Write an enzyme that holds these catalytic residues in place. Structure first.
Site, short mmCIF file in Angstrom:
data_model
loop_
_atom_site.label_atom_id
_atom_site.label_comp_id
_atom_site.label_asym_id
_atom_site.label_seq_id
_atom_site.Cartn_x
_atom_site.Cartn_y
_atom_site.Cartn_z
N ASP A 139 111.42 -111.53 118.41
CA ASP A 139 110.55 -110.45 118.85
C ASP A 139 110.34 -109.43 117.77
O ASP A 139 110.40 -108.22 117.98
CB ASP A 139 111.16 -109.78 120.05
N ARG A 143 106.94 -102.34 116.60
CA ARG A 143 107.61 -101.48 117.58
C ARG A 143 109.10 -101.62 117.59
O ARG A 143 109.77 -100.75 118.12
CB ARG A 143 107.09 -101.73 118.98
N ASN A 144 109.63 -102.70 117.01
CA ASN A 144 111.09 -102.94 116.96
C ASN A 144 111.76 -102.66 115.62
O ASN A 144 112.89 -103.06 115.37
CB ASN A 144 111.37 -104.38 117.37
N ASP A 157 116.61 -103.40 118.25
CA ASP A 157 116.19 -103.90 119.56
C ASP A 157 116.12 -105.42 119.54
O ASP A 157 115.05 -106.01 119.43
CB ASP A 157 114.85 -103.32 120.02
C1 LIG Z 1 108.07 -97.71 119.90
C2 LIG Z 1 108.90 -96.81 120.80
C3 LIG Z 1 109.99 -97.63 121.44
O1 LIG Z 1 109.94 -98.85 121.47
N1 LIG Z 1 111.02 -96.89 121.99
C4 LIG Z 1 111.29 -96.86 123.41
C5 LIG Z 1 112.61 -96.14 123.60
C6 LIG Z 1 113.15 -95.92 122.22
O2 LIG Z 1 114.42 -96.53 122.15
C7 LIG Z 1 115.17 -96.10 121.05
N2 LIG Z 1 114.86 -94.93 120.45
C8 LIG Z 1 115.63 -94.59 119.41
N3 LIG Z 1 115.40 -93.40 118.68
C9 LIG Z 1 114.32 -92.50 118.73
C10 LIG Z 1 114.40 -91.36 117.96
C11 LIG Z 1 113.37 -90.45 117.99
C12 LIG Z 1 112.22 -90.61 118.75
N4 LIG Z 1 111.17 -89.64 118.76
C13 LIG Z 1 109.87 -90.22 118.99
C14 LIG Z 1 108.85 -89.11 119.16
C15 LIG Z 1 108.91 -88.07 118.04
N5 LIG Z 1 108.08 -86.85 118.28
C16 LIG Z 1 108.21 -86.18 119.61
C17 LIG Z 1 107.89 -84.73 119.38
N6 LIG Z 1 106.47 -84.72 118.90
C18 LIG Z 1 105.98 -83.31 118.98
C19 LIG Z 1 106.16 -85.43 117.59
C20 LIG Z 1 106.71 -86.85 117.64
C21 LIG Z 1 110.33 -87.62 117.77
C22 LIG Z 1 111.20 -88.83 117.55
C23 LIG Z 1 112.16 -91.76 119.51
C24 LIG Z 1 113.19 -92.69 119.50
C25 LIG Z 1 116.69 -95.42 119.03
C26 LIG Z 1 117.51 -95.05 117.88
N7 LIG Z 1 118.49 -95.90 117.51
O3 LIG Z 1 117.28 -94.05 117.24
N8 LIG Z 1 117.01 -96.58 119.62
C27 LIG Z 1 116.21 -96.91 120.64
C28 LIG Z 1 116.51 -98.20 121.32
C29 LIG Z 1 117.54 -98.02 122.40
C30 LIG Z 1 112.23 -96.65 121.25
#
Ligand SMILES: */C=C/C(=O)N1CC[C@@H](Oc2nc(Nc3ccc(N4CCC(N5CCN(C)CC5)CC4)cc3)c(C(N)=O)nc2CC)C1
Length: 300
Positions: A139, A143-144, A157
């Site tokens: 996968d 996005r991953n 992921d």
């Molecule tokens: C493509 C997105 C996706 O597939 N997702 C779904 C759930 C998420 O999961 C994980 N997420 C993370 N970390 C992570 C860190 C930071 C962020 N944000 C995204 C949005 C961004 N801004 C919000 C404020 N705005 C004003 C500007 C943009 C800040 C950062 C999102 C996700 C992790 C990880 N290991 O860090 N792991 C997972 C998987 C469980 C990912």
């Protein structure tokens, strides 16, 4: 293969602190948080996954943890441990900037050839490592891949990743919902996944990036994809892509899998290009005690 001596760590809830939420539903909640081992005088930024009990979900996630624990690389997102609370939790390295897909979108105007090409390299590198560990991601998508820093991206992921058994070169998957537009043909036709299956998905992933987050085969129903590929149609050439880059992408989308490039070749090729980014990609003008997870290595 050989014995898998991966270490799996069990962590106390009291040992880590949730700070905020970074997306939740359809799975469970992923929290930004911080983990402090008991005596260590260090604080490690992490992402905590708390399952939405349903035994099925616990099984799934533990399988996810099994896989992550079995891999160690700079380019594969690190798994710190798991917590056997009522609701099982998976603690993993936090990539602050989120998935690369959303990242490229929010920053089209700032990503330069260097950044892009380097990323391509880092993922090829990450993926090649999984080939070494006899792993089929299954996968691979923009996005991953998550962004630790703008200069550093890591694969993560492993919802569908699978570890090949010994003398086993293909994986045959029972039916389930799957990424269609990313998949190799054989995978769509015969539910067979291999590393060269992963390469095609790699090629798409690059396209995902070089279009700054565009959606492949946008509009076209997933139902009709196999015909097309069978027909010899493929994704178009991104505006910024020199012939060199795109040619590389296309070889990933060959029907004959051994026809596709191996990841090492991909690493080597993108690296030469990243030496001179502007020639290969054309763009419109170019917390006191905290330790990163990569910098932390477990006691004994
Ligand atoms: C493509 C997105 C996706 O597939 N997702 C779904 C759930 C998420 O999961 C994980 N997420 C993370 N970390 C992570 C860190 C930071 C962020 N944000 C995204 C949005 C961004 N801004 C919000 C404020 N705005 C004003 C500007 C943009 C800040 C950062 C999102 C996700 C992790 C990880 N290991 O860090 N792991 C997972 C998987 C469980 C990912």
């Amino acid at each position: 293969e050989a014995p898998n001596q991966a270490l799996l760590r069990i962590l106390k809830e009291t040992e880590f602190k949730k700070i905020k939420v970074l997306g939740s539903g359809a799975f469970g909640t992923v929290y930004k948080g911080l983990w402090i081992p008991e005596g260590e005088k260090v604080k490690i930024p992490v992402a905590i996954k708390e399952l939405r009990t349903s035994p099925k979900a616990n099984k799934e996630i533990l399988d996810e943890a099994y896989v992550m624990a079995s891999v160690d690389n700079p380019h594969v997102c690190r798994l710190l441990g798991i917590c056997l609370t009522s609701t099982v939790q998976l603690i993993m390295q936090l990539m602050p900037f989120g998935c690369l897909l959303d990242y490229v979108r929010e920053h089209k105007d700032n990503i330069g050839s260097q950044y892009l090409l380097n990323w391509c390299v880092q993922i090829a590198k990450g993926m090649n490592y999984l080939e070494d560990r006899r792993l089929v991601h299954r996968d691979l998508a923009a996005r991953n891949v998550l962004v630790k820093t703008p200069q550093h991206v890591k694969i993560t992921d492993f919802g569908l990743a699978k570890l090949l058994g010994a003398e086993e070169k293909e994986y045959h998957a029972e039916g389930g919902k799957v990424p269609i537009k990313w998949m190799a043909l054989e995978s769509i036709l015969h539910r067979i996944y291999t590393h060269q299956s992963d390469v095609w998905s790699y090629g798409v992933t690059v396209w995902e990036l070089m279009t700054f987050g565009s959606k492949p085969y946008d509009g076209i129903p997933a139902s009709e994809i196999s015909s097309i590929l069978e027909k010899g149609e493929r994704l178009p050439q991104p505006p910024i892509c020199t012939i060199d880059v795109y040619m590389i992408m296309v070889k990933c989308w060959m029907i004959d899998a051994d026809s596709r490039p191996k990841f090492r070749e991909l690493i080597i090729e993108f690296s030469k290009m990243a030496r001179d980014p502007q020639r290969y990609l054309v763009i419109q003008g170019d917390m006191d005690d905290v330790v990163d997870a990569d910098e932390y290595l477990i006691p004994q």
